[PDB]
RNA sequence: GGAACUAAUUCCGUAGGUGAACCUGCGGAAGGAUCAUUAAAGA
């Protein structure tokens, strides 16, 4: 299968991603690595991932308005500078006490770092040296803000401590001008308003205006009381003279507030999910604001009663409860995750997410109707809801909701749907034992339930448990067709198959079984997993069934054979769930890890082996045609490709015999020796090494060495790996044959002696 | 000592001027190698047989 | 350098240096070679 | 099943026992092999 791995762009350690003034380019960190994905309309690509150290974690990372360089801080007290153009770390240095806050100005020349201890050092972006070091206030530094003009003789740096103290350090003056402990809590966000007034975000709730000057005079112009934590704030030019400060809060409600009055012109959202926006990266000139949410998602909001997000990009899905395909197109896969919302992701680089949050419960189960549209959600919260699956437009609804029962909805399964697209009923179950079938309560099994699945005829249904039993009850009435006998220690999944007509069972031990309606008993028994099976997905061709497993590996087998066909080992630490594309077999694998992957069945690879097996049988008959009649150049090559030594040696027998009137063999054969590969000069000389052993195959070896020496550059022959050890065996046999041939010349002058004593007689 | 050197700088016209002047001289002194084998092969044939 | 049996299954190398592939053999030559390696292994 | 081809430790009292060549819980006994260091209110 052509499995494609999927990874999360924003994950692990909390940090603020750095984006450039232009929409394109973005930086996110997952564990040790940092992933940079350029942002362009219609194209998403990841430039590169920095390996760094897997053991180390990333406290924070920063990108300049123009993305020339990427700056990140490791867990160890050192600073690593990365150059975007060459993808190489130009400089690295120790920042002593680690500083989470890094501030970059529009110009990339100056970068500010805040230590854990509260000591702040300013480092030039271009050269890895510290222009100056400030002892600063004796507290952790919450944030710093730089002020600059493309060309100016005045530069102002503002630093915010954990306590409500703001020091406006002046770089040219090298003095701390001002102290403003108006704030009673650490200042999380500082924004320097254009001329001079200083706006400081207050962690406690107070957002405080200030007057800044080179001279001592400074005063508090205004104080704004907002009912949210000020995570970050900024000044927006839009709205002219009445600039509306941009405020980010713990509740995640973005607020634009009049300057002249404390009233809020417009609030972009309130979100049902209980998340806080860690920090906001705003282009400002482009009037685009990026909000990093506490549910690990990024929302793009334009700046002009409720702010409307232009698009939503989800950096990482922490956990996928289950994988179920939804929609007519089938491009987007509905995601069941540990959150109180439903996320719809498109199927093919950052991926945008459609998100629906019908209930507060993290989704604990999910299901979609086979003919296209509907989606149904099972959650920890007792409420169970049905979702409107339109494929046309961006419209989505959740019209039906079900009161039911006082425990979490373990799983929602709908046997059937009517031809108008309305579900007939919902069977659903719990952490307790109270198992219910609501149309639009039964009990089964003393402990928590695990899975619910259905047959295309609505006749039969089955459900599974931790106390080891599977129950098959009538769908129409309130009747019990039977009970399955038991599995070894707890049944994680139950799956019906259309062609076979079987009920498969996954377990909490490493065994899978196949169960029958007719006898209520085990048809087949499987083994050779490590941990626990978790989910079993039906296969499109109804033969090659797919089981997942809580040891990170997925495996494929046929019920009729009973034997393992294939194993897939491409995921990291776990597996939880599995999806199959209905129309064409594509196995889609879902885990505790934030990686994801799409696999596919590939008869096509057999046709590669068919053409390879055909090619030999094709070329042997040419070879035996060449071995009939000559054309020994082609008889050499097809021997050299398919490695028949005795048929190759017969060519070099005949090639010497035909070469009886520097050219050592046939001339076109000599050109064929010149084009021999490095793997072929090993194999030819190795066969030539064998031929040098006995004196009958002797000279046929020696003429083949003479070509390779006469028709190659000999600097290759030392480069070639393992070729020297072949030369160790060739040489002392040649010296042995050298005396042996020369001694036949020494005996040969008896013929010279038989002339001289004879010609004297004459 | 220098067979590494004169091999890599083979077919220089200055070195091979000397080496052809070597081989034009060195060919004449095969006449003992054609003399020893007669001196060997007879004396082995005479004393044994 | 002793001549040795080749690492690939598709070839057979004899003790004298006459290498034989498994694919250029005839079935009657396949017979004698298995019969020859029978009596040396048996001995 | 048929017929081809290719490939190649001991003991005592007491109580109980269904994996009891006997064991186990509670309390006793030795009739069982003591090396080493040792003033530190050395106020």
UniProtKB/Swiss-Prot annotation, chain A:
It comes from the Eukaryota. One of its GO terms (cellular component) is 90S preribosome. GO terms for molecular function: U3 snoRNA binding. SMART domains: WD40. Keywords: Nucleus, Repeat, Ribonucleoprotein, Ribosome biogenesis, rRNA processing, WD repeat. It is found in: Nucleus, Nucleolus. The keyword Ribonucleoprotein applies. Pfam families: Beta-prop_WDR75_2nd (PF23769), Utp13 (PF08625), WD40 (PF00400). Its main location: nucleus. GO terms for biological process: endonucleolytic cleavage in 5'-ETS of tricistronic rRNA transcript (SSU-rRNA, 5.8S rRNA, LSU-rRNA); endonucleolytic cleavage in ITS1 to separate SSU-rRNA from 5.8S rRNA and LSU-rRNA from tricistronic rRNA transcript (SSU-rRNA, 5.8S rRNA, LSU-rRNA); endonucleolytic cleavage to generate mature 5'-end of SSU-rRNA from (SSU-rRNA, 5.8S rRNA, LSU-rRNA); maturation of SSU-rRNA; maturation of SSU-rRNA from tricistronic rRNA transcript (SSU-rRNA, 5.8S rRNA, LSU-rRNA). WD repeats lie at residues 53-94, 96-133, 136-181, 185-220, 225-267, 358-397, 404-440, 444-483, 486-527, 528-569, 571-608, 618-659. PANTHER family: TRANSDUCIN BETA-LIKE 3, TRANSDUCIN BETA-LIKE PROTEIN 3. Involved in nucleolar processing of pre-18S ribosomal RNA. Present with 8070 molecules/cell in log phase SD medium. Interacts with snoRNA U3. Interacts with MPP10. Component of the ribosomal small subunit (SSU) processome composed of at least 40 protein subunits and snoRNA U3. This is U3 small nucleolar RNA-associated protein 13. It comes from Saccharomyces cerevisiae (strain ATCC 204508 / S288c) (Baker's yeast). The gene is UTP13.
UniProtKB/Swiss-Prot annotation, chain B:
Involved in nucleolar processing of pre-18S ribosomal RNA and ribosome assembly. Present with 2020 molecules/cell in log phase SD medium. It comes from the Eukaryota. Transmembrane segments: none annotated. The lineage of its organism: Eukaryota, Fungi, Dikarya, Ascomycota, Saccharomycotina. It comes from Saccharomyces cerevisiae (strain ATCC 204508 / S288c) (Baker's yeast). Signal peptide: none annotated. It is found in: Nucleus, Nucleolus. This is U3 small nucleolar RNA-associated protein 21. Interacts with snoRNA U3. Interacts with MPP10. Interacts (via WD repeats) with UTP18. Component of the ribosomal small subunit (SSU) processome composed of at least 40 protein subunits and snoRNA U3. The WD repeats are grouped into two tandem seven-bladed beta-propeller regions.
Curated annotation (Swiss-Prot), chain C:
It is found in: Nucleus, Nucleolus. It comes from the Eukaryota. Belongs to the MPP10 family. Involved in nucleolar processing of pre-18S ribosomal RNA. Required for the early cleavages at sites A0, A1 and A2 during 18S ribosomal pre-RNA processing. Component of a heterotrimeric complex containing IMP3, IMP4 and MPP10. Interacts with snoRNA U3. Component of the ribosomal small subunit (SSU) processome composed of at least 40 protein subunits and snoRNA U3. Interacts with the SSU processome subunits EMG1, IMP3, IMP4, KRR1, NOC4/UTP19, NOP1, RPS4A, RPS4B, RPS6A, RPS6B, RPS7A, RPS7B, RPS9A, RPS9B, RPS14A, RPS14B, UTP1-UTP18, UTP20-UTP22 and UTP25. This is U3 small nucleolar RNA-associated protein MPP10. The chain holds residues 496 to 538 of 593 of the full protein.
